[PDB]
């Protein structure tokens, strides 16, 4: 990267300590920018969902993969559940979203609770595979909680066949009381649901698909036990990319696991981490890792800096690791510390190929965590860190080992009323990155890295501009 | 120490301005790290309790010495009380803790007040030296405050003979309603109490013992009056280490006291302070001090920076003093400014041999201060600084001298519900230090000092990570 | 001054950005330090009261001059009032304080209001010049507000003749219910009052006196109108030192006023300001000013930095001005920005001869402002800045000139319950300065300036230590 | 029976005060101070009064100190049968 003359601070830099200087540009609009990555992950947008049980899930994986991103399944998850999740993700449609399905014998409370599992805002009642009505929050209000779905006054729905152009579906929903359109197969069974916003997004985001035209998905493995057997089993399960995640990636165990995984010649890309030094990236790449995971400390649930003082500011670590990888022909991923699209844009300008977002996506409908309401009826969801699952591994021995184990951190993630779904956050981040590219004057991410000019600002410089949310 | 290239700030550094960069490591787990010090203090862990009347006490000394630390008794304490404290500490068992003892004729209010003197959560009723029952907070609830202990419905207790392996004691407490196990001598009298957590800790922490196999203890002396006579008297009392503490250690008086103490050839290690300069450490070591106490200003109750502007950031002072001492073959101690295990880890990486913790331990059950409850029933204890006791020394003359004397600072230290006892804080700090060593890649503290790489971060860098407590 | 190696910041420094590094010392106690100034002002302590109508007054001048300081009367004050103030100050006793006097015909409300005019806490009822009783806050409580003083149950008082050694007076007040001792002349009339604290202070502070043995006092003049005539008139009135104060001291008008005043050969020391540059000090000294006033912006009521952005951090300006003055054989005064004794100690170490304290002393009993009570009955007093009086000078013309005039700033200054009087603040500041001198190892202020070593700290370094009040 | 004996063993004029021992705890003394309306307790050693304990004395003292540590205040003494 290029810095302004005289901008050589005597300390490492974070996302808040840097800014992007505009340059001469010829990009007319945001839509002229290509956001496809070149790291081999197959993602058309530089967004990756972290491998956390509070974030990664079936609905989240499907929604992110449909819009071009990828989701890494949490490590140590049972192999059967991984198989079902992969099959469900790869069995989805590339355009039509999967709605919440209900039976006429279901309870009203179950319908109300399931209404928030998706951002569509409505659920499709299915009888013998055929839609028969719609359930919305207005219908369940005032009704006995233990009545049946068939008692609920099911509302009419706009129906269109599958394969219809999204423009027509958008047109039919212009005056529809409910902004959902059910897509029915030529047989007549339920194929999915579509919305005006979804129809608009269909023409903007290109889904990330494998060689067979199915949505991509990734799985994570630990370094304890037989790493090679687990990696081979997950590769056979249909995973498109493998991640070997650990708290400290610059250790012997990590390198041995990398070598064991690479010896199998599975053919899938390998992601390893985490390191915050050039030597660590050189060691991981030489061991056989194609992509290096970068970041130790900036995790929103990571307490390493408070427990140990060990860590590094994200920006300097990312730039150093990216330079080291590019030197050896590799790629790096920015992990942790993302709160705003500014962080993603700066990480991309730093030299990273992808930006792994973690606890930010936990405050969405698609997150596996159950929706909760605060004292002021404000919706929120609880998120937590992976704790010991990222660490290196008789009741007495169990208690002795768990005495020194780090506690599970927790925090509340509020849901934005206008950005309840993860697709809204994806739109936010993509708009920010596209605006950054237009300001720099780059048509693609490699040009963004090549042409960017960075600067250093003080504490007062960050507060400049509109008050942060 | 080694810093990153270009990290040469134009100001002194604190604990919040530095971070540890991970390196290549081969340490599998935390338990492979040896935390024994090499400064001659005999502590198996780098934790020292400050010589304050609000922190140092019999129970605190016993608990800290059992887990490997040492406690320095406050200066100017009466010699008889010092003798009783030393005898009580050296008469304890290396494995079995000392519980709260009660008589059947004792009041219920006295039992309730004494229940919080230890972290066991229960007290053993003793009649003719034989346990007869147990008193818990549930038993005293609802009972008249002025009834007798014999009126309280004493609960059954799990009994095991002394010398039993801690694994068996842990096994017998698996389903016990009260998580305490009383140890009885072959005669049948009370020898102590043991808990599941204590049984687990017994196999992790090696107690710090003298040549006779008894728990170690230290005492502090001032520089006023006859320093040599007091030092000799305390050495004869059984103290294992002598500390000469004063507010400003780089003065003539201090050096003369050091020379007088060293002329006696007591054979005990000598600790002197406090200085924050290399010249001060050179002067103290040449005077005969084996260990130099470092720190002027970062004390939680020290107002020198506000009254006088005199002081120095702890990290730079510690690194300079450690370099100067090692040059002359000495050792330094970090005193004050510790709030989190990050501070201890950074001080150890700076080059210090031990880290003296002060007011942090005051918010524990073992502290001599009486337990108090806030308006919201939150437990807390008051702590205060040593004031004039650290300064260089007719009602009229007394008032004239006390007119310019510094006031006694005070603050409230809340008790963590999950870390009420000092053993929990010791576990916290030891886990942090072990994780730091594993991240650096060091099997012992000298290797931690040799292999550590430091960095400099701005204000925004410190806020990175999980919100501080 | 001397800074630590590598401590060369790229910005100007304030009081909060610097610290004093301890050195080798041989000063046994605080009382061995001599605080006498060498700038010719005659003050035995480095404390000067600012020329503000909210701070400078008869009682404040007397109290400060008795303890060794000096008070500068506000400019543009009527000459008759200046004459009465000077006569009253020079007619006071060097040991015995002046108490509040009341008549038996006075109202109870007047007595209550006057009780807070002094820190003695009691008033002496005088009939025909002879004390007859004492009035305290307890006596007036519960009594009708419009009763007479003679109705109040006057309490007995300890009486001692003038010239008695303060030790005896302190002894007689050991068991006195009221801690005031009235001093009676050999005739038998009231000469003053004395307290235990006052008796103690009498042996510590040496009063600042002129050649005739009377308390010193100073007066301030502006630069508008005939400066020479006003200066000569104030010199004839008995002022011991002249100050020419203006907002911007580096201007032609200022220099012409200095020349006009110096041409009169009054023989009194001249103080001029304010400038924050070496060139300004050189210009003022060459014009005839013996002492240069330093500081533009750090005033607690100064809005120049917010209205104009013009100013300079106090520490760098003070060190530069002190170096420039000493080069030409002059002296400088630190003005504004004092909140704690740390500021005074740092200003003295910077090279200043005296430290002028302003709005800090406004929150005292001796300040001319009327005592006020907050909503929570907390005592406080209002303070305000000099505004246009420091600026360079038909209803229409008056309004046109006042349209651009700066507004009068105001703020609330709370009274410390333990430091209600200004003597307590003087004790605080003197103790801080003496402790600073002992830490540095200096027996006097010139040695403090010569031997001091300074350092630079970041924002986190300032927060180190006990929480600031 | 004990209550009746205690009631019938009292004096018709002089009230029964709260009695304390020098080895008693400060918390016990504070709690017992409110058992009577006298507002003070009489410290008794070998049947002889030696001092007085009031709420002001116990304030600021460690709760688990002894009664003998408390600064016992002087008391006005008069023989029984005095008018
Ligand atoms: N009936 C019904 N249950 C659902 C639906 N989505 C999720 N669930 C229930 O909720 C559980 C958890 O949902 P998940 O976290 O897998 O999306 C599922 O295993 C299933 O029992 C839906 O659309 N309809
Ligand atoms: N040390 C640690 N790191 C965690 C934990 N949970 C998540 N992380 C890290 O933090 C990243 C997410 O950070 P976020 O984007 O939420 O700020 C994850 O991808 C992972 O690298 C945890 O419990 N401990
Ligand atoms: N009966 C009884 N008193 C105790 C016990 N521990 C402390 N005390 C009382 O509390 C006082 C202060 O306790 P310390 O601060 O020495 O632990 C002791 O001198 C003693 O009077 C205990 O286990 N039993
Ligand atoms: N100047 C001063 N230092 C104190 C006082 N009390 C404790 N200290 C210092 O502060 C250290 C403890 O700091 P802490 O660990 O509580 O932040 C002590 O070991 C001692 O060096 C006091 O009253 N005055
Ligand atoms: N009777 C009486 N009035 C006083 C005393 N001190 C001040 N005053 C009144 O209060 C006014 C203002 O007080 P000053 O601000 O000059 O101290 C005086 O002019 C006088 O009227 C005092 O001791 N006795
Ligand atoms: N510009 C300006 N300076 C003032 C005013 N009042 C006081 N000052 C300056 O501020 C100094 C006092 O500052 P302080 O010690 O209250 O922080 C005075 O001695 C004078 O130099 C005002 O109204 N305007
Ligand atoms: N030491 C002492 N204990 C008392 C005194 N009065 C009451 N107690 C205690 O408090 C209990 C209850 O008091 P009661 O309700 O009988 O007045 C008694 O049985 C006794 O243990 C007293 O004056 N001194």
Dist CA B244 CA B293 (whole Å): 9
Ligand nearest to the CA of C310: 6
Exposure letters C436-468 (e unless 16+ CB within 10 A, then b): bbbbbbbbebebbbebbbbbbbbeebbebbbee
Q: 3-state SS string over C419-443?
A: ECCHHHHHHHHHHHHHHHHHHHCCC
Residues 177-206 of B with CB under 8 A from A: 196-197, 200-201, 203-204
Per-residue tokens: A82: 């991984």
Task: Calculate the alpha carbon distances from C208 to A203, C38, C41, C393 in Å.
Answer: 88, 13, 9, 35
Least CB-CB distance to D28: which of B110, B114, B370? B110
The reply, when asked if residue B69 is annotated as ligand binding, is no
SS3 category, B65: helix
* Residue D44 φ/ψ, nearest 5 degrees: -120, 125
Q: Which residues of D touch B109 (CB under 8 A)?
A: 27-28, 31
Q: How many residues does chain D have?
A: 83
Query: What ligand 6 atom has the least distance to the C-alpha of C386?
Result: 23
Task: Calculate the alpha carbon distances from B105 to B139, B146, C143 in Å.
Answer: 16, 11, 55
Task: Find the closest chain B residue to C462 by CA distance.
Answer: B305
Dist CA C54 CA C69 (whole Å): 18
What DSSP state is assigned to residue D30?
H
* Residue C383 φ/ψ, nearest 5 degrees: -125, 155
SS3 category, C458: coil
Dist CA C12 CA C350 (whole Å): 14
Q: Which residues of B touch A459 (CB under 8 A)?
A: 458-460
- Of A305, C5, C13, A323, whose CA–CA distance to B457 is shortest? A305
Task: Calculate the alpha carbon distances from A261 to A210, A302, C19, C142 in Å.
Answer: 21, 27, 56, 91
Burial bucket for residue C427 (CB in 10 Å: 0-12, 13-18, 19+): buried
CA distance B135 to chain A (A): 27
* Residue C192 φ/ψ, nearest 5 degrees: 155, -170
Least CB-CB distance to B107: which of D28, D62, D64? D28
Task: Calculate the alpha carbon distances from A424 to A53, A417, A467 in Å.
Answer: 21, 11, 21
Dist CA B25 CA B33 (whole Å): 12
B400/C28 CB distance under 8 A: no
Dist CA A283 CA A261 (whole Å): 15
Strand partners, C419: C416
- Of A282, A346, C150, C251, whose CA–CA distance to B23 is shortest? A282
Ligand 7 mean position, distance from CA B128 (Å): 25
Q: 3-state SS string over C49-87?
A: ECCCCCCCCHHHHHHHHHCCCEEEECCCCCHHHHHHHHH
Stretch (H or E) spanning B453: strand B453-456
Q: Is the peptide bond before A274 cis (omega within 30 degrees of 0)?
A: yes
Going C84 to C87 to C92 to C94, the CA torsion angle's sign is: positive
* Residue B384 φ/ψ, nearest 5 degrees: -150, 155
* Residue A276 φ/ψ, nearest 5 degrees: -130, 25
Stretch (H or E) spanning B127: strand B122-127
Contact C439, C20 (CB under 8 A): yes
Find the largest Cα–Cα distance for chain D.
Answer: 41
Question: What is the DSSP annotation of B285-344?
Answer: HHHT-SEEEE-SS--TT--HHHHT-B---HHHHHHHHHHHHHHTT-EEEEES---SHHHH
Q: Mutation test of ligand 3: which of D22, D26, D64 has the most ligand atoms closer than 8 Å to its C-beta?
A: D64
Ligand 1 mean position, distance from CA A144 (Å): 22
Contact C366, C63 (CB under 8 A): yes
* Residue C459 φ/ψ, nearest 5 degrees: -65, -40
* Residue B53 φ/ψ, nearest 5 degrees: -65, -20
Dist CA A86 CA A77 (whole Å): 13
Please report, for chain A, how many H helices and E strands are present, in that order. Answer: 16, 20
Exposure letters C317-354 (e unless 16+ CB within 10 A, then b): bbbbbbebbeeeebbbbbbbbbbbbbbbbbbbbbbbbb
Residues 124-183 of C with CB under 8 A from B: 167, 170-171, 174
Dist CA C368 CA C53 (whole Å): 8
What DSSP state is assigned to residue A53?
T
Question: What is the DSSP annotation of A76-114?
Answer: T--HHHHHHHHHHHHTS-SSSBPPEEE-TTSBHHHHHHH
* Strand C218-221 with C242-245, pairing: parallel
* Strand C453-456 with A354-357, pairing: unpaired
CA distance B71 to chain D (A): 22
Per-residue tokens: C222: 């502006």
Contact C275, C249 (CB under 8 A): yes
SS3 category, C392: coil
Chain breaks in chain C (C to N over 2.5 A) after: 393
* Residue C167 φ/ψ, nearest 5 degrees: -60, -45
Chain breaks in chain B (C to N over 2.5 A) after: 393
- Of C29, C63, C20, whose CA–CA distance to C45 is shortest? C63
- Of C345, C446, C25, whose CA–CA distance to B392 is shortest? C25
* Residue B105 φ/ψ, nearest 5 degrees: -85, -5
Question: What is the DSSP annotation of C303-319?
Answer: -HHHHT-----HHHHHH
B439/A308 CB distance under 8 A: yes
Contacts of C231 (CB under 8 A, 6+ apart): C221, C242, C244, C260, C261, C264, C266
* Residue A360 φ/ψ, nearest 5 degrees: -65, -40
Exposure letters B287-296 (e unless 16+ CB within 10 A, then b): bebbbbbbbb
Residues 283-322 of B with CB under 8 A from A: none
Query: What ligand 3 atom has the least distance to the C-alpha of B123?
Result: 23
CA distance D51 to chain B (A): 23
SS3 category, B186: coil
Contacts of C263 (CB under 8 A, 6+ apart): C228
Contact A312, A353 (CB under 8 A): no
Per-residue tokens: C381: 């007093």
Per-residue tokens: D11: 């004096």
Least CB-CB distance to B145: which of D31, D63, D64? D31
Note the Cα A399 to chain centre separation in Å: 35
Q: Which chains touch A (3 or more CB pairs under 8 A)?
A: B
Per-residue tokens: A387: 């704790």
Tell whether B45 is within 8 A of chain C (Cβ): no
Q: 3-state SS string over A164-192?
A: CCHHHHHHHCCCCCCCCEEEECCCCCEEE
C9/B8 CB distance under 8 A: no
* Strand C291-294 with C2-3, pairing: unpaired
Strand partners, C190: C184
Stretch (H or E) spanning C448: helix C445-451
CA distance B67 to chain A (A): 15
- Of C302, C293, C366, whose CA–CA distance to C331 is shortest? C293
Dist CA A111 CA C425 (whole Å): 71
- Beta carbons within 10 angstroms of residue B419's beta carbon: 16
Contact B216, B241 (CB under 8 A): yes
Q: Which region holds residue C408: left if phi is over 0, alpha if psi is between -120 and 50, else beta?
A: beta
Q: How many residues does chain A have?
A: 469
Q: Which chains touch C (3 or more CB pairs under 8 A)?
A: B
Tell whether C5 is within 8 A of chain B (Cβ): no
Dist CA B351 CA B366 (whole Å): 30
User: E strands, A118-246, where?
Assistant: 122-127, 130-136, 158-161, 181-184, 190-194, 218-221, 242-245
Angle, CA B66 vertex, CA B65 and CA B71 arms, to 5°: 15
Chains B and A touch (3+ CB pairs under 8 A): yes
Least CB-CB distance to B464: which of A251, A313, A406? A313
C468/B306 CB distance under 8 A: yes
* Strand B331-335 with B354-357, pairing: parallel
Ligand nearest to the CA of B354: 4
Contact A298, A306 (CB under 8 A): no
- Beta carbons within 10 angstroms of residue B41's beta carbon: 24
Per-residue tokens: A297: 């400390």
Contacts of D7 (CB under 8 A, 6+ apart): none
Per-residue tokens: B29: 């787990």
Q: Is the peptide bond before C461 cis (omega within 30 degrees of 0)?
A: no
B248/C439 CB distance under 8 A: yes
Dist CA A183 CA B430 (whole Å): 60
Dist CA B414 CA B433 (whole Å): 24
Dist CA B209 CA B216 (whole Å): 5
Q: Mutation test of ligand 6: which of C73, C314, C336 has the most ligand atoms closer than 8 Å to its C-beta?
A: C336
**Which technique?**
cryo-EM
From atom 1 of ligand 4, which residue's Cα is the shortest distance away? B302
Question: What is the DSSP annotation of B197-230?
Answer: HHHHHHTTPPP-B-TTS-B--EEEE-SSS-HHHH
Angle, CA D24 vertex, CA D18 and CA D25 arms, to 5°: 105
Q: Please, what is the angle between helix A314-327 and helix A341-350, to 10°?
A: 30
Task: Find the closest chain A residue to B205 by CA distance.
Answer: A400
* Residue C433 φ/ψ, nearest 5 degrees: -65, -40
What DSSP state is assigned to residue B467?
P
Find the largest Cα–Cα distance for chain A.
Answer: 73
Dist CA C367 CA C357 (whole Å): 13
Ligand nearest to the CA of B299: 4
Ligand 7 mean position, distance from CA D28 (Å): 10
Which residue's entry shows tokens 């409110």?
A: D34
Q: Which chains touch D (3 or more CB pairs under 8 A)?
A: B
Dist CA A374 CA A371 (whole Å): 10
Contact D51, D73 (CB under 8 A): yes
Q: Which region holds residue B212: left if phi is over 0, alpha if psi is between -120 and 50, else beta?
A: alpha
Q: Please, what is the angle between helix C341-350 and helix C314-327, to 10°?
A: 30
Contacts of B289 (CB under 8 A, 6+ apart): B244, B258, B262, B270, B271, B272, B330
Dist CA A390 CA B291 (whole Å): 40
Contacts of A226 (CB under 8 A, 6+ apart): none
SS3 category, B423: helix
The reply, when asked if residue A295 is annotated as ligand binding, is yes
- Beta carbons within 10 angstroms of residue B8's beta carbon: 11
From atom 7 of ligand 6, which residue's Cα is the shortest distance away? C385
Dist CA B181 CA B227 (whole Å): 46
Rg of the Cα atoms in chain D: 14
B465/A276 CB distance under 8 A: no
**Resolution of the coordinates, Å:** 2.8
Contact C67, C209 (CB under 8 A): no
Q: Is the peptide bond before C274 cis (omega within 30 degrees of 0)?
A: yes
Q: Mutation test of ligand 7: which of D32, D44, D52 has the most ligand atoms closer than 8 Å to its C-beta?
A: D32
Q: Count of CB contacts below 8 A, A vs B?
A: 172
SS3 category, B107: strand
Burial bucket for residue C8 (CB in 10 Å: 0-12, 13-18, 19+): exposed
Per-residue tokens: B285: 């070591």
Contacts of A122 (CB under 8 A, 6+ apart): A99, A100, A115, A134, A135, A136, A178, A180, A193
CA distance D40 to chain B (A): 18
The reply, when asked if residue C376 is annotated as ligand binding, is no
Contacts of C336 (CB under 8 A, 6+ apart): C295, C297, C298, C299, C300, C302, C314, C356, C358
Dist CA B216 CA B43 (whole Å): 8
Which residue's entry shows tokens 């604990």?
A: B15
Dist CA B358 CA B335 (whole Å): 8
Strand partners, C71: C49
Burial bucket for residue B78 (CB in 10 Å: 0-12, 13-18, 19+): exposed
Angle, CA B207 vertex, CA B203 and CA B209 arms, to 5°: 150
* Strand B181-184 with B190-194, pairing: antiparallel
The reply, when asked if residue B337 is annotated as ligand binding, is no
Strand partners, A123: A100, A135
SS3 content of chain A, % helix, strand, coil (to 5): 35, 20, 45
Query: What ligand 7 atom has the least distance to the C-alpha of D21?
Result: 1
From atom 19 of ligand 2, which residue's Cα is the shortest distance away? A50
Ligand nearest to the CA of C59: 5
């Amino acid at each position: 990267v290029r810095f302004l003359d005289g901008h050589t601070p005597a300390y490492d830099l974070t996302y808040n300590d840097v800014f992007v200087v505009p340059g001469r540009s010829d990009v007319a609009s945001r839509f002229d920018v290509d956001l496809s990555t070149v790291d081999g992950s197959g993602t058309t947008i530089p967004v990756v969902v972290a491998n956390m049980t509070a974030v990664a899930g079936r609905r989240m994986a499907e929604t992110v993969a449909r819009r071009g991103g990828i989701v890494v399944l949490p490590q140590d998850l049972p192999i059967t559940a991984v198989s079902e999740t992969v099959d469900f993700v790869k069995s989805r449609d590339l355009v039509v979203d999967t709605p919440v399905t209900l039976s006429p014998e279901d309870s009203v409370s179950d319908a109300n609770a399931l209404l928030h599992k998706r951002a569509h805002g409505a659920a499709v009642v299915v009888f013998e595979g055929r839609p028969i009505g719609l359930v919305t929050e207005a219908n369940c209000a005032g009704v006995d909680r233990f009545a049946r779905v068939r008692d609920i006054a099911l509302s009419d729905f706009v129906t269109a066949p599958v394969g219809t152009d999204p423009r027509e579906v958008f047109d039919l929903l212009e005056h529809a009381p409910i902004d959902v359109a059910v897509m029915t197969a030529p047989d007549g069974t339920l194929a999915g649901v579509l919305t005006r916003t979804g129809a608009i997004r269909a023409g903007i985001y290109t889904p990330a698909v494998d060689a067979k035209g199915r949505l991509r998905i990734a799985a994570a493995v630990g370094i304890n036990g037989d790493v090679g057997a687990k990696a081979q089993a997950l590769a056979e399960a249909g995973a498109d990319l493998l991640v070997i995640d650990t708290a400290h990636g610059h250790q012997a165990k990590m390198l041995d696991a990398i070598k064991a995984v690479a010896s199998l010649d599975l053919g899938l890309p390998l992601v390893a981490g985490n390191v915050v030094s050039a030597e660590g990236t050189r060691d991981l790449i030489e061991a056989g890792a194609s992509i290096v995971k970068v970041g130790v400390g900036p995790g929103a649930m990571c307490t390493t800096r408070m427990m140990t003082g060990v860590g590094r500011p994200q920006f300097s670590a990312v730039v150093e690791c990216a330079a080291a990888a590019r030197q050896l022909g590799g790629h790096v991923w920015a992990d942790g510390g993302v709160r705003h699209p500014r962080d993603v844009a700066l990480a991309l300008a730093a030299g990273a190929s992808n930006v792994m977002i973690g606890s930010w996506f936990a405050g969405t409908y698609e997150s596996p965590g159950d929706l909760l309401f605060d004292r002021d009826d404000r919706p929120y969801k609880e998120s937590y860190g992976m704790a010991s699952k990222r660490a290196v591994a008789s009741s007495f021995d169990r208690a002795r080992k768990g005495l020194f184990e780090e506690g599970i951190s927790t925090s509340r993630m509020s849901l934005d009323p206008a950005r309840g779904g993860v697709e809204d956050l994806l739109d936010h981040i993509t708009s920010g990155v596209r605006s950054t590219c237009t300001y720099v004057g780059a048509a693609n991410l490699p040009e963004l890295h090549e042409k960017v000019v960075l600067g250093v600002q003080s504490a007062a410089g960050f507060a400049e501009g509109h008050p942060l949310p």
